[PDB]
Amino acid sequence: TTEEEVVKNMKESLEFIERAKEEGDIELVISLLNLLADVAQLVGGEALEILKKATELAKELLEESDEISEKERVQLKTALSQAEVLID
Amino acid sequence: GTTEEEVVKNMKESLEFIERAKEEGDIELVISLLNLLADVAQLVGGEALEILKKATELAKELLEESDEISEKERVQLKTALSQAEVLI
Amino acid sequence: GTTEEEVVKNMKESLEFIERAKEEGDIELVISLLNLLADVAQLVGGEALEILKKATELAKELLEESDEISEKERVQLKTALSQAEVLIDK
Numbered sequence: 001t002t003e004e005e006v007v008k009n010m011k012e013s014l015e016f017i018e019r020a021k022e023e024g025d026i027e028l029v030i031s032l033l034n035l036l037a038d039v040a041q042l043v044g045g046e047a048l049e050i051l052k053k054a055t056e057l058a059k060e061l062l063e064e065s066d067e068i069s070e071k072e073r074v075q076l077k078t079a080l081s082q083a084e085v086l087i088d
Numbered sequence: 089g090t091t092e093e094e095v096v097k098n099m100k101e102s103l104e105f106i107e108r109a110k111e112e113g114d115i116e117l118v119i120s121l122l123n124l125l126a127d128v129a130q131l132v133g134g135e136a137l138e139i140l141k142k143a144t145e146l147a148k149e150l151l152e153e154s155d156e157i158s159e160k161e162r163v164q165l166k167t168a169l170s171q172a173e174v175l176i
Numbered sequence: 177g178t179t180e181e182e183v184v185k186n187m188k189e190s191l192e193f194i195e196r197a198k199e200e201g202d203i204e205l206v207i208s209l210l211n212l213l214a215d216v217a218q219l220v221g222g223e224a225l226e227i228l229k230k231a232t233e234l235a236k237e238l239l240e241e242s243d244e245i246s247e248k249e250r251v252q253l254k255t256a257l258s259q260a261e262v263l264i265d266k
């Protein structure tokens with residue numbers, strides 16, 4: 001792989017998170033936020049900027065959604081913790 | 089700072105959800121939370137690893153407590169357990 | 177605690193389940209196991225990285241060959257592949 005191929009995949013993941021927030025697809029936000037954080041922890045650099053954008057959207061979903069279950073809340077906040085520690 | 093404290097606070101809530109999950113048979117949730125707690129604990133250390141040790145003990149029991157756990161679920165849980173056990 | 181042989185054992189069984197999930201079209205399992213393998217391989221190196229390499233080749237094959245993979249499954253699988261491929265090069 002190249003870094004450019006990785007950031008393209010991370011960008012497409014970010015776009016799906018943007019739409020998943022409107023859709024209420026909480027599970028995919030949890031899964032993609034965890035996957036993006038696993039990638040950015042190995043890549044650093046621009047991968048962390050994309051993770052920062054994904055983290056912002058997940059935070060908003062966590063605050064604005066009235067559909068999120070208690071199980072999804074605890075998973076999403078744990079994934080947020082991984083991201084927040086990386087983007088700090 | 090406020091980051092690490094919120095992190096370990098979030099991890100403690102997840103610990104409680106893993107316990108309920110282990111009793112409802114929500115093995116998927118146990119797998120997901122154990123992997124998320126390990127991803128966080130790897131970056132934080134300290135009290136995060138104490139919390140991970142406890143979640144590992146909870147997940148280890150569920151392994152062979154009620155044969156509701158499928159073969160696919162078992163291999164995923166064992167792989168997640170391995171991640172956590174190495175960090176411990 | 178755990179031993180490297182116990183971890184390598186679990187990693188080999190995961191790879192067996194991945195290859196089976198590839199031919200059964202179980203996309204979700206491949207995504208979950210590929211990510212779990214990369215998480216473990218990051219901490220152990222050695223033969224863990226060789227098992228990850230095999231799992232990565234199988235997941236690439238699944239991405240190119242399968243037909244009932246959803247759009248959302250695809251973007252998860254590509255990102256998990258990115259994680260694995262970066263670790264293999266680290």
Ligand SMILES: [Ca+2]
Pocket residue numbers: 022023024025
């Ligand atoms: Ca919806």
Ligand SMILES: [Ca+2]
Pocket residue numbers: 034038123127211215
């Ligand atoms: Ca992970």
